[PDB]
C-alpha cells in the first residue's frame, strides 16, 4: 500500500475532490454500513469526482486501499482497523483531519444505510457522537498534549464505533 | 435513588474511603466484569472502608445504586447506563472526576476478572485506554468548551466501553 502522502499527491494531481483522509473515511463508511458489491466505485466517483472515473494508476492503489480497509474490519484478529488521518504533527491539524475523516465516514455509512436516522440505543448514540465530532472545534496555540491526550481517546472511540457499526451492519 | 450530592454527604459522614463518584465506578467495574452474587459487599467493604461494613441507612441507598447500575447495564433498551460523575461545572473538575471514576472502575473490573491482563483485541485496547484516561492530565484556566467538547466524547467512549465489557463478561 502506498503511503498517505503518496495517495494525497496522486489524488491532487488527478483533480479528485477528496484528499487521502477523506477517501479513507468515505470508503470505511461504505464498508461499515455493510456495502458488499462493486457499487462503491460509482458512489466514489459521484461524491469525489463529479461522476468521472478515476484515471488508471490511481484506480489500483485506491482499490488496494478499499480491500485493506475491508480485511482489517472483518477483523484481522480484533481491532486492526486504523483511521488513516494526516501525519501532520500539529495537534490542531490532527483535530481538523479527524473531523474531515468523520464527515466522509458519515456520508458513506449513510449512503449504505439510508434509514440510519432510525437507529436508537448505542448505534444512534454513536451516530450522534460522530456528527458532534466532525464539528469538534478547538483553538489557541496550545500545540500541547493537553489536546493531544484527549484526541487520542476520541480517535480510539471512533475506531471502536467503526467496529460496532461493521458488526451491526455486516 | 438519592442524589449525587446526598450520597457524597452520607459517605463522608460515615468516614467511608470513597466519595459517590468512586463508589459508582467500583460497583460498575464489578458488574461489568460479570460479578453476580453478593460478594460485591465484602469487596466494597475491603476496598472502601478497611473491611468494616457500612452503617444502616447508608447500606440501603448504596444497594439501590448497585441494582440500578446492574439493571441499566442489562440494557434498559440499549445505552441507558450513566457514569455518575461530579455535577461540578468546572470542566477541569469534571476531568478529574472522570479519572477518579476510572481508577475505581478498573479496580472493580480487575477484581472481577483476575486475568484481564491477558485480553487482547478491542477488550485489551479499551483496558489500555481506560488506564490512560485515569491519568488524563490537563491544565490552564481554559474553563472552556474546548476541553468540554473533547471530554464529553471521552465520556461517551467510557460508557461504550462499559457496555462492551458487560457483554463480554456477562
From Swiss-Prot, chains A, B:
GO terms under cellular component: cytosol
Domain of life: Bacteria
InterPro entries attached to this UniProt entry: YgfB-like, YgfB-like_sf
Transmembrane residue ranges: none
Family as reported in the entry's similarity comment: Belongs to the UPF0149 family.
Entries under NCBIfam families matching the protein: PRK01736.1, ygfB_yecA
PANTHER family reported in the protein's UniProt record: UPF0149 PROTEIN YGFB (PTHR37528:SF1)
Name of this protein: UPF0149 protein HI_0817
Organism in which the protein naturally occurs: Haemophilus influenzae (strain ATCC 51907 / DSM 11121 / KW20 / Rd)
Amino acid at each position: 500500500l502506498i503511503s498517505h502522502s503518496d495517495m494525497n499527491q496522486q489524488l491532487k494531481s488527478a483533480g479528485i475532490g477528496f484528499n487521502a483522509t477523506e477517501l479513507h473515511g468515505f470508503l470505511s463508511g461504505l464498508l461499515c454500513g455493510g456495502l458488499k458489491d462493486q457499487s462503491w466505485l460509482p458512489l466514489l466517483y459521484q461524491f469525489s469526482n463529479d461522476n468521472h472515473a478515476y484515471p488508471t494508476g490511481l484506480v489500483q492503489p485506491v482499490t488496494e486501499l478499499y480491500e485493506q480497509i475491508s480485511q482489517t474490519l472483518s477483523d484481522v484478529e480484533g481491532f486492526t482497523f486504523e483511521l488513516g488521518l494526516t501525519e501532520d504533527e500539529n495537534v490542531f491539524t490532527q483535530a481538523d483531519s479527524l473531523s474531515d475523516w468523520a464527515n466522509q465516514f458519515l456520508l458513506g455509512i449513510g449512503l449504505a444505510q439510508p434509514e440510519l436516522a432510525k437507529e436508537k440505543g448505542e448505534i444512534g448514540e454513536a451516530v450522534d457522537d460522530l456528527q458532534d465530532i466532525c464539528q469538534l472545534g478547538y483553538d489557541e496555540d496550545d500545540n500541547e498534549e493537553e489536546l493531544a491526550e484527549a484526541l487520542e481517546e476520541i480517535i480510539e472511540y471512533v475506531r471502536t464505533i467503526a467496529m460496532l457499526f461493521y458488526s451491526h451492519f455486516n
